[PDB]
Amino acid sequence: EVQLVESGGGLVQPGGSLRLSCAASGFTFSSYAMSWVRQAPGKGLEWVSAISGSGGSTYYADSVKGRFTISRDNSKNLLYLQMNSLRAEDTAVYYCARHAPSTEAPDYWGQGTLVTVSS
């Protein structure tokens, strides 16, 4: 029913930039806050960024400030993460997640896409 499918990941050189999409379906997208979560190799899950349903409020992890931009198209039902000034420590699998309005707990997940930052 509910589906999130990510794409736009892959290989990129340091200093390079890259844009991830998370295509949503099966729910009314604009009613839900969305987020990006990453997992560095052999690490735990870490929050990257988050946007409210209407797009008017966002959170950024301190580690990506000034480089990453979250956004969404509430008519194309897509969530984006524009990633600039990339470096090796940004190498991770990136997940988009949908959040229940009641609790803001994540209740649906994308399949993940690897971003590899290497010369």
Next chain:
Amino acid sequence: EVQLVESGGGLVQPGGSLRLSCAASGFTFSSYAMSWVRQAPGKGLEWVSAISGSGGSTYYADSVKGRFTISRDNSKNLLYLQMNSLRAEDTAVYYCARHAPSTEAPDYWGQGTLVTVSS
């Protein structure tokens, strides 16, 4: 003891840009969410934008998304609103406000500064 003094207001042509400053003093600035509030001539107070203490989270009124950028310097204890693509309808007195951590209620205000968008 606590003080907020705003500066940077004044004239500006439509489509032009302008940066507001809210200089704080007398408190541990990074510990408090800040906001910009405006009041158009003869109107009620409306939220413009707001930022958490650390800077990691922001809110924008929809009337302004894409054109204003709130930010702060936690070492110069200053709050800013960068206003771009200004229009006559942005004409108002702009106030900065400090928010109590225990409610996020505003407990201190700047003296307000007039922005006049006209030719």
